[PDB]
Design an enzyme around this catalytic site. Structure first.
Site, PDB file in Angstrom:
ATOM      1  N   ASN A  26     -15.414 -37.640  74.450  1.00 42.22           N
ATOM      2  CA  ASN A  26     -14.971 -36.314  74.942  1.00 42.22           C
ATOM      3  C   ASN A  26     -16.213 -35.531  75.390  1.00 42.22           C
ATOM      4  O   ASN A  26     -17.315 -35.758  74.834  1.00 42.22           O
ATOM      5  CB  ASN A  26     -14.174 -35.578  73.856  1.00 42.22           C
ATOM      6  N   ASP A  44     -17.087 -32.580  74.533  1.00 42.32           N
ATOM      7  CA  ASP A  44     -17.665 -31.792  73.408  1.00 42.32           C
ATOM      8  C   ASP A  44     -18.528 -32.673  72.489  1.00 42.32           C
ATOM      9  O   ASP A  44     -19.032 -32.121  71.478  1.00 42.32           O
ATOM     10  CB  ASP A  44     -16.578 -31.044  72.643  1.00 42.32           C
ATOM     11  N   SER A  87     -17.384 -35.275  70.738  1.00 37.25           N
ATOM     12  CA  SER A  87     -16.492 -36.018  69.822  1.00 37.25           C
ATOM     13  C   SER A  87     -16.063 -37.291  70.562  1.00 37.25           C
ATOM     14  O   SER A  87     -16.362 -37.424  71.768  1.00 37.25           O
ATOM     15  CB  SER A  87     -15.331 -35.184  69.366  1.00 37.25           C
ATOM     16  N   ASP A 136     -12.646 -40.225  70.856  1.00 35.23           N
ATOM     17  CA  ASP A 136     -11.229 -40.567  70.596  1.00 35.23           C
ATOM     18  C   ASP A 136     -11.159 -42.067  70.302  1.00 35.23           C
ATOM     19  O   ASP A 136     -11.813 -42.847  71.016  1.00 35.23           O
ATOM     20  CB  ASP A 136     -10.350 -40.221  71.795  1.00 35.23           C
ATOM     21  N   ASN A 194      -9.135 -38.046  67.516  1.00 36.56           N
ATOM     22  CA  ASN A 194     -10.400 -37.366  67.854  1.00 36.56           C
ATOM     23  C   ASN A 194     -11.225 -37.208  66.570  1.00 36.56           C
ATOM     24  O   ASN A 194     -10.660 -36.759  65.553  1.00 36.56           O
ATOM     25  CB  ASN A 194     -10.013 -36.058  68.556  1.00 36.56           C
ATOM     26  N   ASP A 233       0.633 -30.650  62.543  1.00 35.60           N
ATOM     27  CA  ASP A 233      -0.396 -29.570  62.475  1.00 35.60           C
ATOM     28  C   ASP A 233       0.104 -28.275  63.140  1.00 35.60           C
ATOM     29  O   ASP A 233      -0.591 -27.251  63.015  1.00 35.60           O
ATOM     30  CB  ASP A 233      -1.723 -30.008  63.111  1.00 35.60           C
TER      31      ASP A 233
END
Ligand code: NA
EC number: 3.2.1.17
Length: 129
Positions: free
Chosen positions: A46, A48, A50, A52, A59, A101
């Site tokens: 990703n 940012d 991070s 997947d 993630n 979530d």
């Protein structure tokens, strides 16, 4: 492992994803198709920093530990490598937490953009379930 479509449908149903948080099996198969092309070994970085992991591209920012995602959480309490196994148990258990979530399957941007509102039952067509 690259799952067949019906092969993954059977595995996801066995693990209790059919109608989990109200999402029919075809929603989960559709998500897995566009996240991973049904490949357990799929990894994607990703923007940012991070990553997947696995069939449902879970993630490292929130859900698994990969040791290279600063300020990140590990809410499924698993190494991200466990999400690449031929056995989808860890991916399914962790996906049940994600979809619970608050935003349901909108957590998977590929589900929102490519599966949401579509004829997702097509993804389990011809499958002996
Ligand atoms: Na993490």
């Amino acid at each position: 492992k690259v799952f067949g479509r019906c092969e993954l449908a059977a595995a996801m149903k066995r693990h209790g994803l059919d109608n989990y948080r109200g999402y029919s099996l075809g929603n989960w198969v559709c998500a897995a198709k566009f996240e991973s092309n049904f490949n357990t070994q799929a990894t994607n970085r990703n923007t940012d920093g991070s990553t997947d992991y696995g069939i449902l591209q879970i993630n490292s920012r929130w859900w698994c530990n990969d040791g290279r995602t600063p300020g990140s959480r590990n809410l499924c309490n698993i190494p991200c490598s466990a999400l690449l196994s031929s056995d989808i148990t860890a991916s399914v258990n962790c996906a049940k937490k994600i979809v619970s979530d608050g935003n349901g399957m909108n957590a998977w941007v590929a589900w929102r953009n490519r599966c949401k509102g579509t004829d997702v039952q097509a993804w389990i067509r011809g499958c002996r379930l």
